Curated annotation (Swiss-Prot):
Component of the BRF-1 ISWI chromatin remodeling complex, at least composed of SMARCA1 and BAZ2B, which regulates the spacing of histone octamers on the DNA template to facilitate access to DNA. Within the BRF-1 ISWI chromatin remodeling complex interacts with SMARCA1; the interaction is direct. Component of the BRF-5 ISWI chromatin remodeling complex, at least composed of SMARCA5/SNF2H and BAZ2B, which regulates the spacing of histone octamers on the DNA template to facilitate access to DNA. Belongs to the WAL family. Residues 9-113 form the Bromo domain. Regulatory subunit of the ATP-dependent BRF-1 and BRF-5 ISWI chromatin remodeling complexes, which form ordered nucleosome arrays on chromatin and facilitate access to DNA during DNA-templated processes such as DNA replication, transcription, and repair. Both complexes regulate the spacing of nucleosomes along the chromatin and have the ability to slide mononucleosomes to the center of a DNA template. The BRF-1 ISWI chromatin remodeling complex has a lower ATP hydrolysis rate than the BRF-5 ISWI chromatin remodeling complex. It is found in: Nucleus. This is Bromodomain adjacent to zinc finger domain protein 2B. It comes from Homo sapiens (Human).
Amino acid sequence: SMSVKKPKRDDSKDLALCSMILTEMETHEDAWPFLLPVNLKLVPGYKKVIKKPMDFSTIREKLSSGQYPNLETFALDVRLVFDNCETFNEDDSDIGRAGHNMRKYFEKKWTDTFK
């Protein structure tokens, strides 16, 4: 509350460390469904159904231009990528399996880097 604060967690490396995680996600062999925004002209249903599209390139641009206020808003966009994927793709599909694999990969890196 006013003039009453928990001890200050060092957040000075968060930007660098989120960049490194995002690099690792970009270079994973199962990243291909997530590298670029879904083409809303060419994929019937996507625009109406997926209210907030998100992809790795869009996260990279937001990250590089100071549009994440803190490491939690960064995790929220990464998870959005996988939540969108599950919304639109059957679990038993190459892209559906890709999304599960990447979400796992991300959540481990996230825990090991920050928890």
